């Protein structure tokens, strides 16, 4: 194993996927308001 | 209060547009680490 | 009618937010693939 | 080949984009009844 | 002017559901990559 | 190194990245009108 580089991969592709699902949890948050 | 609704669905799109944008950050990433292995396999 | 137009748009912005939550799913599945592509690589 | 490792990815990984798609064009549907 | 409007979030939702589109496209190609690489590795 | 196949994924993959984040532009700007 390399812990290391898969760990740098990792999270910079998860730290977008989990952006990208937190501006949706927003976007229908505020749809919610309607 | 209709006016209302209309300005909520800009804010709500300008979100969704945002979680494209940073989904299409999450591709590009991942295809530089693909192309990364490839060159990894090749040498 | 201009009420229901508006309700049209939320129910279209909706779907479109569901339409990016699967690619972002099936982003997540392939990056998996990829990681244990290096590790057979690694192996 | 792999054929049984190659399907089982395949098909997670197309059934998300194909969702992905239907959603699309349902929201592209409801936009054109305005 | 208030149907402006509207009409406005629809283009502009119009062009968000094409982004997604393309960038779902953009997946597919790569996800074509990552297998061939399984299969060079394979071979 | 091998250019060739590299240059003709990293297109394909690119113009779809590419034309993904200008679509959004076209909303963001759009958006901004009113």
Same mark, same amino acid.
């Given at each position: @194993?390399?812990?290391?580089? &898969?760990? &740098?991969?990792?999270? #910079?592709? #998860?730290?977008? @996927? =989990? =952006?990208? #699902? =937190?501006? &949706?949890?927003?976007?229908?948050? &505020? @749809?919610?308001?309607? | 209060?209709? *006016?209302? *609704?209309?300005?909520?669905?800009?804010?709500?799109?300008? !979100?969704? +547009?945002?979680? %494209? %944008? !940073?989904?299409?950050?999450? %591709? !590009?990433?991942?295809? !530089?680490?693909?192309?990364?292995?490839? +060159?990894?396999?090749?040498?």
């Amino acid at each position: @194993l390399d812990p290391i580089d &898969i760990s &740098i991969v990792l999270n #910079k592709i #998860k730290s977008q @996927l =989990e =952006e990208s #699902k =937190e501006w &949706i949890r927003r976007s229908n948050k &505020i @749809l919610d308001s309607i | 209060h209709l *006016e209302g *609704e209309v300005n909520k669905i800009k804010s709500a799109l300008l !979100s969704t +547009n945002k979680a %494209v %944008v !940073s989904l299409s950050n999450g %591709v !590009s990433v991942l295809t !530089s680490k693909v192309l990364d292995l490839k +060159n990894y396999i090749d040498k």
